[PDB]
Amino acid sequence: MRMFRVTACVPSQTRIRTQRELQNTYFTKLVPYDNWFKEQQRIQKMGGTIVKVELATGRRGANTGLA
Amino acid sequence: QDAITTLINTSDAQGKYLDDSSLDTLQEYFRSGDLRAKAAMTISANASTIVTKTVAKSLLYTDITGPGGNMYTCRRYAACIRDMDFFLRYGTYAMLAGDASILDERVLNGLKETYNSLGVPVGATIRAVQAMKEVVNDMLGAEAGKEVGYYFDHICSGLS
Amino acid sequence: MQDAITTLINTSDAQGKYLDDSSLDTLQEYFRSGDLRAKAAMTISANASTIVTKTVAKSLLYTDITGPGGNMYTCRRYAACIRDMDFFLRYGTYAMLAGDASILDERVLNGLKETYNSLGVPVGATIRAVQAMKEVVNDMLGAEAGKEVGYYFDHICSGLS
Amino acid sequence: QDAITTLINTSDAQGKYLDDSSLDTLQEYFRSGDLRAKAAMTISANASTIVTKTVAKSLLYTDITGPGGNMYTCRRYAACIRDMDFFLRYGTYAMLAGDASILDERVLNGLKETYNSLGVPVGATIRAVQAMKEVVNDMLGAEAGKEVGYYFDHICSGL
Amino acid sequence: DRTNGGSPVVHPQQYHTVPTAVINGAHQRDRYPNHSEMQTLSTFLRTGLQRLEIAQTLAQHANEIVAAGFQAINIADYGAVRMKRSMRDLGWFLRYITYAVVAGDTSIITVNTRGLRGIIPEDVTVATTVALQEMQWKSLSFFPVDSAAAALVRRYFDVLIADYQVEKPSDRYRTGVSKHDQGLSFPESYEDSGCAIPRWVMKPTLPDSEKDAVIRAAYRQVFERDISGLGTAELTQPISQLKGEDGSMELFIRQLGKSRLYRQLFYEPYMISRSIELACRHFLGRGLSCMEEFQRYFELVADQGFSALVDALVSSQEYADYFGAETVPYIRGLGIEAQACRNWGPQLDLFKYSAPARKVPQFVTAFASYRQPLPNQHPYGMGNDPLETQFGAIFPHETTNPAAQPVHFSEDSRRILVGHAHRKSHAEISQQIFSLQHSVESVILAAYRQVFGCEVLGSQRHQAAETQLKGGLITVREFVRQLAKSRSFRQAYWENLYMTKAAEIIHRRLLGRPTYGRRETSKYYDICGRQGFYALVDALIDSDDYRTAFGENTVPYERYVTPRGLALRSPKGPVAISKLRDNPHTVGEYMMR
Amino acid sequence: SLVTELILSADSEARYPAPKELRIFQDFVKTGEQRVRIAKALAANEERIVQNGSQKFWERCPNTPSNSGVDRKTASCQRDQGWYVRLIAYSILAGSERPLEDIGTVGIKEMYNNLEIPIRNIAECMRCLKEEAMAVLSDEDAQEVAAYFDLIIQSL
Amino acid sequence: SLVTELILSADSEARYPAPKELRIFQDFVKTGEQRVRIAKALAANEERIVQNGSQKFWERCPNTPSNSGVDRKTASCQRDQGWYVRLIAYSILAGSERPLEDIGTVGIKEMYNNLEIPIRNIAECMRCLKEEAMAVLSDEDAQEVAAYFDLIIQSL
Amino acid sequence: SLVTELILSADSEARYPAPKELRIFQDFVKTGEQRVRIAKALAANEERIVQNGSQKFWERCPNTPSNSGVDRKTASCQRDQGWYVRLIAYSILAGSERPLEDIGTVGIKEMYNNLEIPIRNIAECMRCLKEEAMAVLSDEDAQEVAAYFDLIIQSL
Ligand SMILES: *[C@@H](C)[C@H]1/C(=C/c2[nH]c(/C=C3N=C(/C=C4\NC(=O)C(CC)=C4C)C(C)=C\3CCC(=O)O)c(CCC(=O)O)c2C)NC(=O)[C@@H]1C
Ligand SMILES: *[C@H](C)[C@H]1/C(=C/c2[nH]c(/C=C3N=C(/C=C4\NC(=O)C(CC)=C4C)C(C)=C\3CCC(=O)O)c(CCC(=O)O)c2C)NC(=O)[C@@H]1C
Ligand SMILES: *[C@H](C)[C@H]1/C(=C/c2[nH]c(/C=C3N=C(/C=C4\NC(=O)C(CC)=C4C)C(C)=C\3CCC(=O)O)c(CCC(=O)O)c2C)NC(=O)[C@@H]1C
Ligand SMILES: *[C@H](C)[C@H]1/C(=C/c2[nH]c(/C=C3N=C(/C=C4\NC(=O)C(CC)=C4C)C(C)=C\3CCC(=O)O)c(CCC(=O)O)c2C)NC(=O)[C@@H]1C
Ligand SMILES: *[C@H](C)[C@H]1/C(=C/c2[nH]c(/C=C3N=C(/C=C4\NC(=O)C(CC)=C4C)C(C)=C\3CCC(=O)O)c(CCC(=O)O)c2C)NC(=O)[C@@H]1C
Ligand SMILES: *[C@H](C)[C@H]1/C(=C/c2[nH]c(/C=C3N=C(/C=C4\NC(=O)C(CC)=C4C)C(C)=C\3CCC(=O)O)c(CCC(=O)O)c2C)NC(=O)[C@@H]1C
Ligand SMILES: *[C@H](C)[C@H]1/C(=C/c2[nH]c(/C=C3N=C(/C=C4\NC(=O)C(CC)=C4C)C(C)=C\3CCC(=O)O)c(CCC(=O)O)c2C)NC(=O)[C@@H]1C
Ligand SMILES: *[C@H](C)[C@H]1/C(=C/c2[nH]c(/C=C3N=C(/C=C4\NC(=O)C(CC)=C4C)C(C)=C\3CCC(=O)O)c(CCC(=O)O)c2C)NC(=O)[C@@H]1C
Ligand SMILES: CCC1=C(C)/C(=C/C2=NC(=C\c3[nH]c(/C=C4\NC(=O)C(C)=C4CC)c(C)c3CCC(=O)O)/C(CCC(=O)O)=C2C)NC1=O
Ligand SMILES: [Cl-]
């Protein structure tokens, strides 16, 4: 299935992480196509600066066979 | 994408039906299907044996296997034969599909970067892939071995 | 993560033999610094809030990076900086006890600089903060154990530079 | 909840310092603790062999491993083995705690409902756990085997 | 008044000892404790000599310790109650120091002391810390300070003073994730008392064994158990993509969810709603908070499958807020975060390892039926309602497939029963009566078919009562009582039965109707518990309802049932509930005018 | 297609083609001659299929943008009918409805609502084209084509 | 069974079975008589299959618990062999290895490792049973049976 | 190592290493001298240990690829035995089987199945090395090395 290689840093603005709830924000992550719209919207909702979006798997203009 | 899917994509880009040349391509695939299925049965029959022989004939008894080498430690030998089984299964998939698009989508992308990141030696890896090509060529014959070894050379170039 | 013993074993394992006399002598050094490393860890664990207090007082407070438009302005960001300082101290403690800066290179320094450049955290400011925290550990631990913990705080700074 | 927790819970519920009988109970726990730990280590190093021997002597060549039995269909056999390992390791947890609270909170609650929903024979389970008690007794010694068979018997009580 | 979500047994941890913490760690890693955890337990049990004797000497000299314990306050100005609380607090602090010394952990001190700065009026905090320092000095004064455990007593007193000097610590907040989700607050004392849960974070540069530990914890979160030892966890491409520099823990959680292993475990044996609840457990670490969350999930599954539900759970704001990118989901229970009361019963039945043992979806039933009136149910739950067949005491087992909906009915509450009198007619219900159906023999047989819903074997015949009734010595009522006092009746309806279930089924066989409420059921249960089976049989036969309905010469018959009984007695639906619409016209087929 | 779906089903449990997958592949390759015959027939007679389908669809549903007097709308409807029967030809060639799904029948409702075209009118028209596809094809040919025509019907 | 996975694949995406899946169902439904014949064949000559397989297995490996002089262990080995060829017959009848998987290969290694029996010994005995089924069955039946045999070989 | 695992357990819950963990630290540090004595003892006599383990293992299990007549295979088996006793000494030095697990008992079964040597043969050979380490080491020493021997038993 066609994948997105996405690097983004999503900051927290509504919670203070005490010592363990802190995880990371600068993630590079392979994203499936059918979820990337919702992941882009989610990390835009939380307030993340998306610095790098490329097509990891699949080609451009695929009429079929892309999944 | 497979051979039929690539043909449909090309004729959908050009917007027309499949012409007589693309129908010749499709009849080529459809008459190769039976022997490709027999070779898929054969590769599914002895995959572990093929991996055993190829690690013996290409990767063992060089100092890559011993200490300070990349297949040293039990887990790295397991990871190496895991990668060899990956290449065998995905070359089998590409043989069934008639196109190396599955290798370009799931195998070859990111793999060179990850192998250079982990310190995996690409040269011995490509040697292991073509030794696998030789063993499959030996245990299946010329024609089916040629068809699967073409995709093995595709993997060999993708690592290259 | 890897500790001093684990790295000694790992070089000797990649070479293919038992621990030679030099590797065992490094092991002697580690095993005879273990008591002071444990005591320093107890002290750092007991006084963590105080160390962050004096550290932020001597490097970060009273300058315009805490002013309006600054990075530690808007209280939640200041508390974020407190959390980062406490995290750096605790991971320097882990590095000091293990005898190795591998845990920092795996869990602290891996992608932290890029992260801060994405959030707009001033890298030089937190580096000065880590050197101030090194000075605080120096003052309230002693010269010897203070220098030892300062080695891994230097590793944090170098991975941040 | 270990034995220390239950003792301090009683003392704080009555609102006093640890009484002499309470301190004596802590003394028995604390100076049997070394044999408890030793038994815990050798139970950790020989858990697989114990489960093997207990299935061999209690659950093999009965008609529950045969067709239509509850330990037919190899995945059900692996589930049976894993249940035996869970029982061994949680009896070990209780042995190290000195209290059956980890059993009551993590094994015996949830187990009867699961076994009756899945159709698992309770009797075959209890005879397997008592075979476990005998095997740990034989490979440990009378005192350590009795001290861990107390918790194996608590598990059998909840079944 | 409102239906019950269940009150499960909960053990809230007030602190941690040394053994409890080690066993908690080993349990939360699903392994035997290892050599360093072994050394933890054995070294603490080694120091147990010194710890127990420290507690001995402190408890022995407690009176003088708190007698010895800035501007010293006046007794008369402070107040008698406040002086009493000062002395009580001081003795309490010393007690908790001895508790910590025996337990080997200062978790009890730190949890119970850290947020005390303003609970104590905070104008006497200088007096408080001076008194605690003086207690430290005195406790060490009669416990020799050269190199002994007086260093330990000094450290524990120092930890107590350090916890007490900590000012107002911020309460943890479980913020509401939607308009339907209530936000919750959480004291830090409750956070620090709660059992430590490992936070499995997978970074790309971790060693292999740490990575495999994170994989195993991912299996334990998602598949509820370790599947890595089995060959079913052959997911070599997802694992391999996860280990190195790509395919992070969130993508791996999604790949575990969409795998056919997860479908075989938590989707194949379940209906959609129970599957949604289990997915909520396995991908967010918590159950359904509210009904509207379940509406969202159920509609989404209905138009897009369960894999899209997994995609939506792991793609949600709450998932990235708690578990982010590379943190394994963890179960969010009692001390991990603040708990809601809304889903308390279902979520504590869901976090339990026997959550797959329940098939009926617990969250939706509780959430929906709270917003509904009381159900038609036996007062002691639905397991006490037998199956309305001709014979057989068939009750729902509490353990085998628990489909339990607990409900509190009042004492005066009465069940609605569907009577056969208003329904049907007469000469339609007087065919099932059998008074004095005039032959004696038929009346014996019908009295059997009431007492035991089918005709019984010869060994179950009460032939002496047959001879008595054929001779006219006893009437029909006494014969029915003798049949209900026969041994085979006791075996059929009293021995292999829960006692209130036994009383209810005997009431249904001897009265022909279910009980109404806690009046009747309470009286029968009290009778059969303080007096026994024959006493209940005599009290039911001599019940005024038996005399009004069945008199003395009439065999009992079924008169009332539960509405579920008629729903069973109409599998094609009820007769005429609204006029049917045979040969209707719909739009589209009409529009093609 | 059937091949890609079989491979990704083999990919999912990280394994080789199972005893059934090769069997389905052999069935596909041996029915390939029939599938190519269907595709050739459809590509040869698409013009008259579209014309007869539009004839029946306007005799049946006339309250359509297809016959609202604008010739551009009518020509667009004819082109859409030819496109959909070409996608059915792609489906029978590929052995699976995925050329139909990935091109014609996934975003179909949102798109044709955006065009303000009534969805059930398109369903009626696809039923007309399916009936004419029966009218020109043999029994197995028309069964395999009616498969994907009812895929288009379901997507509307 | 194969049709179970067809229905489960139509499920979990909340859709009806595609006519491609219906075609898989048709093909399996017409191969059913051949599969019933193969299962009858296995139930016919299972006795000689276990006898000859144990013979060649002890010929190629005498260092097994099955020939350690304890005849109860040889009875258990014979019965395991017979159960497994019964499961392969079940797999033929169901058209998928999922009966074989869910009865004899999911917790395979845990069971046999508890039984103190080498895994590759069972694998080599399965190779012997595969060769016996090769010897006694016709070529298409031989391929169909030996494929599920190979599935067991992979499980070990 | 024990140090690493102490640090990891103090991690993953974001806490400092507890006083009990530092007791473990300061005691494993006082365990150090006996650990160096064991590593030196196992390194000093390793050749005779592998010789006598090979002697008893060839006495007890002769159906091995080590005594098939190929001295290359024999030398490789002796190399594996020396490597494993080296790893067990490493585990004494570290205080836990973490070097043992990471280097030799994580992908043990998959590798030796790629090398086709029977797993129980390796188990018998390591049992021979275990009893020679009982022969050459004192009682406490025999315990600390036999622990990781039992770990190697579990993996095979
Ligand atoms: C004084 C009020 C009484 C008292 C209280 C007490 N409660 C708990 C624990 C909990 N209380 C709640 C309550 C709520 N959760 C909700 O969502 C709502 C509505 C907003 C309420 C009211 C919950 C869920 C808990 C569990 C713990 C948690 O914080 O989530 C305790 C502690 C229990 C223990 O022993 O651990 C106490 C002490 N105690 C009294 O004696 C007063 C009568
Ligand atoms: C064996 C012929 C060579 C070799 C192998 C080796 N590989 C790794 C680690 C990885 N291999 C991969 C590759 C893939 N993962 C996939 O999912 C796919 C399928 C399409 C491929 C091709 C990856 C991503 C890794 C890292 C993560 C993982 O553990 O799988 C190792 C281990 C390296 C290490 O230090 O961990 C090794 C040893 N080594 C050789 O010397 C051979 C030439
Ligand atoms: C304090 C010394 C300096 C400072 C701090 C500051 N940090 C943030 C935000 C974050 N800090 C982190 C850090 C970590 N996460 C990890 O997993 C680890 C190990 C790799 C670390 C050290 C993260 C991830 C964030 C973002 C999310 C979160 O806050 O938890 C801020 C906020 C910046 C912003 O909101 O954009 C600040 C202010 N700033 C200074 O000026 C000090 C010198
Ligand atoms: C074996 C000696 C007996 C037996 C066991 C058996 N158990 C199951 C299935 C399960 N067992 C459990 C129990 C637990 N899981 C845990 O994590 C804990 C410890 C905290 C316990 C007690 C569970 C939850 C299951 C469900 C599925 C699973 O495998 O995990 C089975 C399979 C039942 C089935 O039909 O699926 C079996 C066979 N059965 C016997 O006859 C023996 C007496
Ligand atoms: C329609 C024939 C009748 C009807 C229906 C109705 N149902 C609901 C609500 C729900 N229905 C379900 C059902 C299921 N859960 C499952 O897992 C399965 C799949 C096999 C089914 C069928 C559930 C869980 C709900 C709640 C979630 C939801 O609302 O979607 C309602 C709404 C009730 C409410 O209060 O909103 C209705 C109206 N009602 C009738 O009158 C018809 C006879
Ligand atoms: C016989 C073909 C099968 C069989 C039967 C079997 N039945 C029972 C026990 C009961 N059977 C019933 C049935 C009914 N009650 C009704 O009212 C009606 C009509 C609606 C029926 C059919 C009941 C209630 C019981 C329990 C009480 C009683 O025994 O009278 C048993 C005994 C099982 C036990 O443990 O008691 C058996 C064996 N068993 C088979 O193997 C056949 C397939
Ligand atoms: C023969 C090829 C090999 C062999 C066999 C052997 N098996 C046993 C004992 C058992 N085998 C099983 C097997 C199964 N039970 C199931 O439900 C399934 C699914 C169909 C299987 C495969 C079981 C459960 C047992 C235990 C006995 C019982 O039924 O209760 C033995 C005996 C082992 C022992 O220690 O007694 C043996 C010898 N041995 C070989 O050497 C061959 C490689
Ligand atoms: C000896 C106890 C058994 C045995 C062994 C045997 N081994 C080989 C070949 C190799 N052994 C290894 C093993 C390792 N490399 C590692 O990094 C690790 C972790 C320390 C291990 C365990 C390797 C990699 C090889 C390949 C070649 C080499 O020498 O490196 C052989 C030869 C195989 C062949 O026939 O080609 C043998 C015989 N044989 C027995 O019978 C014993 C039970
Ligand atoms: C708008 C959010 C915000 C606030 C409120 C803030 C706090 C702050 N006040 C600060 C400090 C003080 N606040 C106070 C304030 C009080 N002194 C008191 O005893 C009382 C009752 C107050 C009310 C707040 C004092 C004396 C200081 C001296 C600084 C110190 O002791 O370190 C600083 C130090 C740095 C600087 O001034 O540049 C900070 C960071 N800075 C912020 O970003
Ligand atoms: Cl302590």
From TrEMBL, chain A:
Binding sites annotated in the UniProt record for (2R,3E)-phycocyanobilin: R2, Y33, Q44
Protein name stated in the entry: Uncharacterized protein
Record organism: Synechococcus sp. (strain ATCC 29403 / PCC 7335)
UniProtKB/TrEMBL annotation, chain D:
Name of the protein in its database record: Allophycocyanin, beta subunit
Modification N4-methylasparagine, positions: N70
Protein origin, superkingdom: Bacteria
TrEMBL record, chain E:
Binding site for (2R,3E)-phycocyanobilin 1: Q182, Y190, Q339, C341
Binding residues for (2R,3E)-phycocyanobilin 3: I272, S273, Q295
Residues reported in the UniProt entry to bind (2R,3E)-phycocyanobilin 4: Y380, R518
Transmembrane regions listed in the UniProt entry: none
Residues that, per the record, bind (2R,3E)-phycocyanobilin 2: S240
Name of the protein in question: Phycobilisome protein
Organism: Synechococcus sp. (strain ATCC 29403 / PCC 7335)
Taxonomic lineage of the native organism: Bacteria, Bacillati, Cyanobacteriota, Cyanophyceae, Synechococcales
Automatic annotation (TrEMBL), chains F, G, H:
Entry binding sites for (2R,3E)-phycocyanobilin 3: R72, C77, R79
UniProt-annotated binding residues for (2R,3E)-phycocyanobilin 2: S66, R72, K73, C77, R79
Binding site for (2R,3E)-phycocyanobilin 1: S66, K73, C77, R79
Name under which the protein is recorded: Phycobilisome protein
Species assigned in the record: Synechococcus sp. (strain ATCC 29403 / PCC 7335)
Taxonomic lineage of the native organism: Bacteria, Bacillati, Cyanobacteriota, Cyanophyceae, Synechococcales
